[PDB]
Paper text:
The prodomain encircles mature TGF-β homodimer in a ring-shaped disulfide linked homodimer “straitjacket”, (latency-associated peptide, LAP), forming L-TGF-β5. Interestingly, both TGF-β1 and -β3 LAPs contain the integrin binding motif RGDLXXL/I and bind to two integrins, αvβ6 and αvβ8, which together account for the majority of TGF-β1, and some of TGF-β3 function, in vivo.
To simplify structural analysis, we focused on αvβ8/L-TGF-β3 without GARP. Further classification reveals L-TGF-β3 rocks over the top of αvβ8 in a much larger range than L-TGF-β1 bound to αvβ822. Indeed, in all conformational snapshots, the L-TGF-β3 straitjacket domains, including mature TGF-β3 peptides, are not resolved. Overall, our structural studies of αvβ8/L-TGF-β3 and αvβ8/L-TGF-β3/GARP reveal similar but more dramatic redistribution of conformational entropy as seen in the αvβ8/L-TGF-β1/GARP, since we could not isolate any subclass with either GARP or complete L-TGF-β3. Thus, we conclude that intrinsic flexibility of L-TGF-β3 is further enhanced upon αvβ8 binding by a similar conformational entropy redistribution mechanism as seen with L-TGF-β1/GARP. Indeed, analysis of supernatant from L-TGF-β3/GARP TMLC cells cultured on immobilized αvβ8 contained significant amounts of released TGF-β as opposed to supernatant from L-TGF-β1/GARP TMLC cells which did not. In contrast, because L-TGF-β3 has higher basal conformational entropy, αvβ8 binding results in more entropy redistribution towards the lasso domain resulting in L-TGF-β3 passing a flexibility threshold sufficient for releasing mature TGF-β3.
Author numbering:
A (entry chain E): 240 to 249
B (entry chain A): 1 to 440, 485
C (entry chain B): 72 to 398, 404 to 425
The structure:
C-alpha cells in the first residue's frame, strides 16, 4: 500500500 | 575577509512575519536602481478574507531601509460555485521562496491549497506568481486534473525555485506522487503567454517535468531544494536538486540535463538521517570555468575525540572536472547543533583574486545560538577549508531563535564598487542584513 | 554509596603536561525493578497489530517476574503531527481520517499519554482494550517526537529513578526526521522539553521533530533504554540507526505479532547484559582515555564497552586523564544505568 490509509484502501 | 561587518545595512519587517525567510537582489537593468527582495511567508496582507497569506517586499538601498510589498495578487479566494470556494489563500506561505533574474520576480506559496473540480477537497498544490515587469502572471504547474496524494495534489509546488540562464524557471515540488517529489521547468515566455485567469489548470507545451517512479521512491522529497549550472558541457544550465530522504534517508542530489530533464549525475549521503541534500548550490569555486557542486547535510553527526557522536553538520564540496566526474571534499561544522550547511550562498569573487568564494551558514551556532555565517575563499586547488571570515548574528532570541544565516544571497555588486556583496536573512527576528565587500574599484 | 558504579566520586590533581589515572568498576546487580512503557503507533497502518496488545499484560508480567524485582507497565500512543500535508484537513476527513473507508477512526493526535507506569496489570489490559485506531496520509509517522516527550516527561509517565527504565516504541513505518517539518511550515527547532498538558502533547503542531543527536542526548540523560518493536521491512531502518543511538535495541514483530512478549524479554536480557560508558568531559583542556577491561580479558575502547555481562561479575574501566592546556568535573556514566561516577578535577596553572 501507499500512504497510511493504503492498508484500508487495499 | 573583506566583508564590511562594521556598518551593515539592516532591514526589518512586521513582527512574526518571518521577514527574511527568503532574500534576493532585484536588478532590472532597464532602470539603474538596485533593490533587495525579502520574503515574508507569514505576513498579513490586504487580500479580502485572507489571513497570513504572505508577502514579498522590495527594499531600497539608496540611503533608506524602507520596504514596500510587491502587489503580486490583491484578490481573495476564487469561487468554484455559489458558496463553494475554489481555493484557500489563508496560511499559504507566499514568499517562502523568491527569485529574480533581471527584471522578472518569481515568488511562490508552497502551502497554498485548492479545491479540485471533481470534489470538495483541500489539496496543498502550492502556487507561484511571476512578475515580468509590467505584467504579473500566476504559475501553478502542480495544480491540475490528475491531482491527489497519488498525483500532484500534495505537490507543494514552488517549495524551491531557481532561474535558468536561458530564461527558464526551475520549480521543485517535494510532495507529488506520495511525496516522491518532482521537478518542473517551463520557459518564461510560455508561462506569460499561456496564462488565462479563468483556466485553473493551464497546459504548457514546452514544459519539462520529471515523472512518477516506483513506490520505493515515496517520501523522497525530490524538489526540497534546487540549483542550476552547466554540468554536461553544452552551455545549457542543468537542474540540480536535493532529495534529502532518498536512499533510506541517506539523502541524494540528482542532476538532470536542462535540455530534456534527463538524469546525468547522482550524489548520495553517507550517514542516515543527516539530510544530505537539504541545501544545494552550484558555482565554479576553483576558477576553471566548470561549475562545482555544494551540498549541505546540516544534521550530520561526527565522531568526536572520545568516540561520541556530535551533530555539527557537513557541506560536501565537489569540484567538477573535464573528464565528466567530480572530486569531493567534506567540510564539517564547528559547533554542535548549529546546523552547518543549512544555507550555501555562492559569493562570486568576493575579493577579486580570480577565484569565486562561497558562504555557508550555521543558523543556530555562535554565542547564544544566534546564528553564524562562514566565508570561504576559492583557490586553484579548490575551496580554502579555513573560513577567511566569520559573520555573527547580532539579534537576541525572541520566542523562537534568531536563525541568522537561514537564507542568504550574494554575487551582486549592489553598490557598484566592483566587489560582490551579500544579504543575510534572520527570519526568527524578522531581519535582513546587507554586508558590503570592502576593497582590497 | 553507589550500588553498581564504584567509586561514585573521585578527586584528582593535575598539572600541565602531566597525567593521572584511576580504575572505575561497574557491577550490575541481580534483579532490577523494571519500568516498561508501551509507546504504540496507533495509525491506520497498525490496525491488525493493535488488537494483539491485549496479550502483553498478564503473560508478560509472569514472564518478567523471573528477571525483575518488580515489573511496571504503561501505555501511550502517537500517529503524527495534525497538520497538512501529513493529514487531510478537509472538515470531513480532518477528525475522521478513515471517512472514505468507513471505519470508526479516532481523531489524529501527536502523542497522548494514556496510562502512567503502574503495578496493576488490569489497568494496562483495560486501557489497551479500549484504545482505537487513528489515521493520516503519509507513511512516515511521528515516532521520534513522542519518544522524546515520553523520555523527558518524568513525572507524567512515572519513571522511577530506582528502576531499569524501558521505553518500547512499537511501529510499522519509518519516523519523521527533524527537517521534514518544513513542508508544514514548521521551522522552529525542537527544544527537547516536556509539553504534556492534559496528557496530550500540545506542541506537536508548532515545532519540528527532534534530530537523532537530540533524541539520543535526551534518552541517555534520562537513562531510557529504548526497545524498537517494528513489524515490516522498516525494521532494518531502525536497526541501521542503532549505531547512531547508543543504548537502543530493535526487535522484529512477526507478521502476526505473536512474539511481542518474547521480544520484550529478549531485549531486556540483551540490555542488562551490556555495559558501556561515556564521559561528559566539559572540563576545558583535559582529555580522557577510557579503556574497558572486559571480564574475559579483552581491552575494548570503552565507548563500545563489553557484552555478555552478568551479576557476580564486574566490568573494569581504566580511565587515563591527560592535561593538555588550562582555562570543574567530568561524569563517566554507564549508559542505561541509574548511577554515575563524578570525576572532580582540581589543578593549578
Ligand atoms: C539516480 O538515482 C535515481 C534513483 O535511484 C535513478 O532514477 C531511477 O531510475 C530507474 C531506472 O532508470 C527508474 O526505474 C524504472 O525503470 C524502468 C525501466 O524498465 C526497464 O527495466 C526494468 C528493470 O527491472 C524492466 O523490468 C522493464 O521491463 C524494462 O526493461 C521503467 O519502466 C520504470 O517506469 C515504470 O514504472 C513507473 C512506476 O510504476 C511508471 O510510472 C512508469 O510509467 C513505468 O510503468 C511501466 O512499468 C510498470 C512496472 O510496474 C508497469 O506497471 C506499467 O504498466 C508500465 O509498463 C522506472 O522508470 C526509477 O523510476 C528512477 N527513479 C527516480 C526517482 O528517478 C536515476 O536513474 C539515477 N541516475 C544516475 C545518473 O545515476
Ligand atoms: C494576522 O492577523 C490575524 C488577524 O486578522 C492575527 O490573528 C491572531 O491570531 C492569534 C493566534 O495566532 C490570536 O490569538 C488573535 O486573537 C488573532 N487576532 C485576531 C484579531 O483575530 C494574526 O496573528 C496576524 N499574524 C501576523 C503574522 O501578523
Ligand atoms: C487493579 O485495577 C482493577 C481495575 O482496572 C481493579 O479491579 C476493579 O475493582 C473495582 C473495585 O475497586 C471493581 O468494582 C471492578 O469490577 C474491578 N474490575 C476488574 C476488571 O477487576 C483492582 O481492584 C485494582 N487492584 C488494585 C490492587 O488496585
Ligand atoms: C539505582 O538502582 C538500584 C536498584 O533499584 C537502587 O537500589 C535500590 O534502592 C532502593 C531505594 O531507592 C532500595 O530500597 C533498594 O533496597 C535498593 N536495592 C538494591 C538491590 O540495592 C539504587 O538506590 C539506585 N540508585 C540511584 C542513585 O538511583
Ligand atoms: C591502566 O592504565 C594505566 C595507564 O594509565 C596502566 O599503567 C601503565 O601501564 C603501562 C603498560 O603496562 C606501563 O608502561 C606504564 O608505566 C603504566 N603506568 C602509567 C602511568 O602509564 C595500567 O597498567 C592499566 N591497568 C590495566 C589493568 O590495564
Ligand atoms: C537528452 O539531451 C542530451 C543533450 O543533448 C542528450 O545527450 C541525451 O541523449 C538526451 N536524452 C534523451 C532521452 O533524449
Ligand atoms: C587513547 O589511547 C590510545 C592508545 O590506547 C591512543 O591510540 C589514542 O590516540 C588515545 N586518544 C586520546 C584522545 O588520548
Ligand atoms: C557469557 O558469560 C558466561 C559467564 O562468564 C559464560 O559462562 C558464557 O560462556 C559466556 N557466553 C559467551 C557466548 O561468551
Ligand atoms: Ca548542460
Ligand atoms: Ca570548477
Ligand atoms: Ca576570492
Ligand atoms: Ca560591493
Ligand atoms: Ca504519517
Ligand atoms: Mg502508519
Amino acid at each position: 500500500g501507499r500512504g497510511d490509509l493504503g492498508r484500508l484502501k487495499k | 575577509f573583506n566583508l564590511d561587518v562594521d556598518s551593515p545595512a539592516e532591514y526589518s519587517g512586521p513582527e512574526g512575519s518571518y521577514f527574511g525567510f527568503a532574500v534576493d537582489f532585484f536588478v532590472p537593468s532597464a532602470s539603474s536602481r538596485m533593490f533587495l527582495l525579502v520574503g515574508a511567508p507569514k505576513a498579513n496582507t490586504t487580500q479580502p478574507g485572507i489571513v497570513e497569506g504572505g508577502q514579498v517586499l522590495k527594499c531600497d538601498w539608496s540611503s533608506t531601509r524602507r520596504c514596500q510589498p510587491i502587489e503580486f495578487d490583491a484578490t481573495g479566494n476564487r469561487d468554484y460555485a455559489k458558496d463553494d470556494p475554489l481555493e484557500f489563500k489563508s496560511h499559504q506561505w507566499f514568499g517562502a521562496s523568491v527569485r529574480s533574474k533581471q527584471d522578472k520576480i518569481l515568488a511562490c506559496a508552497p502551502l497554498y491549497h485548492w479545491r479540485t473540480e471533481m470534489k470538495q477537497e483541500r489539496e496543498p498544490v502550492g502556487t507561484c506568481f511571476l512578475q515580468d515587469g509590467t505584467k504579473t502572471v500566476e504559475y501553478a504547474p502542480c495544480r491540475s486534473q490528475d491531482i491527489d496524494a497519488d498525483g500532484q495534489g500534495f505537490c507543494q509546488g514552488g517549495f524551491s525555485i531557481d532561474f535558468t540562464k536561458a530564461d527558464r524557471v526551475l520549480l521543485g515540488g517535494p510532495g507529488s506522487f506520495y511525496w516522491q517529489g518532482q521537478l518542473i521547468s517551463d520557459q518564461v515566455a510560455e508561462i506569460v503567454s499561456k496564462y488565462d485567469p479563468n483556466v485553473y489548470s493551464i497546459k504548457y507545451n514546452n514544459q519539462l517535468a520529471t515523472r512518477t517512479a516506483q513506490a520505493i521512491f515515496d517520501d523522497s522529497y525530490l524538489g526540497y531544494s534546487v540549483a542550476v549550472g552547466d554540468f554536461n558541457g553544452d552551455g545549457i544550465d542543468d537542474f540540480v536538486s536535493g532529495v534529502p530522504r532518498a536512499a533510506r534517508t541517506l539523502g541524494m542530489v540528482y542532476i538532470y540535463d536542462g535540455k530534456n530533464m534527463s538524469s546525468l549525475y547522482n550524489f548520495t549521503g553517507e550517514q542516515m538521517a543527516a539530510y544530505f541534500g537539504f541545501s544545494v548550490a552550484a558555482t565554479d569555486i576553483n576558477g576553471d570555468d566548470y561549475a562545482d557542486v555544494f551540498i549541505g547535510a546540516p544534521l550530520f553527526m561526527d565522531r568526536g575525540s572520545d568516540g561520541k557522536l556530535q551533530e555539527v553538520g557537513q557541506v560536501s564540496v565537489s569540484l567538477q572536472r573535464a573528464s565528466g566526474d567530480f572530486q569531493t571534499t567534506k567540510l564539517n561544522g564547528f559547533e554542535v547543533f548549529a546546523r552547518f550547511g543549512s544555507a550555501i550562498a555562492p559569493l562570486g569573487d568576493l575579493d577579486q583574486d580570480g577565484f569565486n568564494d562561497i558562504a555557508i551558514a550555521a543558523p543556530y551556532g555562535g554565542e547564544d545560538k544566534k546564528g553564524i555565517v562562514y566565508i570561504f575563499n576559492g583557490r586553484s586547488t579548490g575551496l580554502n577549508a579555513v573560513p577567511s571570515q566569520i559573520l555573527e548574528g547580532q539579534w537576541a532570541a525572541r520566542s523562537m531563535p534568531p536563525s541568522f544565516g537561514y537564507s542568504m544571497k550574494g554575487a551582486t555588486d549592489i553598490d557598484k564598487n566592483g566587489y560582490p556583496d551579500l544579504i543575510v536573512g534572520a527570519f526568527g527576528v524578522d531581519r535582513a542584513i546587507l554586508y558590503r565587500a570592502r576593497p582590497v574599484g | 554509596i553507589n550500588t553498581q558504579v564504584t567509586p561514585g566520586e573521585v578527586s584528582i590533581q593535575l598539572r600541565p603536561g602531566a597525567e593521572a589515572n584511576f580504575m572505575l568498576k561497574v557491577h550490575p546487580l541481580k534483579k532490577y525493578p523494571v519500568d516498561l512503557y508501551y509507546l504504540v503507533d496507533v495509525s491506520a497502518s497498525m490496525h491488525n497489530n493493535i488488537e494483539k496488545l491485549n496479550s502483553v499484560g498478564n503473560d508478560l508480567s509472569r514472564k518478567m517476574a523471573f528477571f525483575s524485582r518488580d515489573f511496571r507497565l504503561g501505555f501511550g500512543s502517537y500517529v503524527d503531527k495534525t497538520v497538512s500535508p501529513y493529514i487531510s484537513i478537509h472538515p470531513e476527513r480532518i477528525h475522521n481520517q478513515c471517512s472514505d473507508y468507513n471505519l470508526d477512526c479516532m481523531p489524529p493526535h501527536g502523542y497522548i499519554h494514556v496510562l502512567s507506569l503502574t503495578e496493576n496489570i488490569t489497568e494496562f489490559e483495560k486501557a489497551v482494550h479500549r484504545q482505537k485506531i487513528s489515521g493520516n496520509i503519509d507513511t512516515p509517522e511521528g515516532g521520534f517526537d513522542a519518544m522524546l516527550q515520553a523520555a523527558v516527561c518524568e513525572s507524567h509517565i512515572g519513571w522511577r529513578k530506582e528502576a531499569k527504565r524501558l521505553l518500547l516504541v512499537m511501529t510499522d513505518q519509518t519516523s519523521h526526521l527533524a527537517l521534514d517539518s518544513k513542508l508544514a511550515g514548521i521551522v522552529v527547532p525542537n527544544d527537547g522539553n516536556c509539553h504534556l498538558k492534559n496528557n496530550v502533547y500540545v506542541k506537536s503542531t508548532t515545532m519540528e521533530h527532534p534530530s537523532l543527536g537530540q533524541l539520543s542526548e535526551k534518552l541517555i540523560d534520562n537513562n531510557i533504554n529504548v526497545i524498537f518493536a517494528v513489524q515490516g521491512k522498516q525494521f532494518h531502518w531502525y536497526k541501521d540507526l542503532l549505531p547512531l543511538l547508543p543504548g537502543t535495541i530493535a526487535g522484529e514483530i512477526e507478521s502476526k505479532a505473536a512474539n511481542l512478549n518474547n521480544l520484550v524479554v529478549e531485549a531486556y536480557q540483551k540490555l542488562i547484559s551490556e555495559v558501556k560508558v561515556q564521559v561528559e568531559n566539559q572540563v576545558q583542556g583535559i582529555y580522557f582515555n577510557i579503556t574497558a577491561i572486559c571480564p574475559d580479558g579483552s581491552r575494548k575502547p570503552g565507548m563500545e564497552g563489553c557484552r555478555n555481562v552478568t551479576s557476580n561479575d564486574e566490568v573494569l574501566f581504566n580511565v587515563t586523564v591527560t592535561m593538555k592546556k588550562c582555562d570543574n568535573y567530568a561524569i563517566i556514566k554507564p549508559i542505561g544505568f541509574n548511577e554515575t561516577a563524578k570525576i572532580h578535577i582540581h589543578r593549578n596553572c
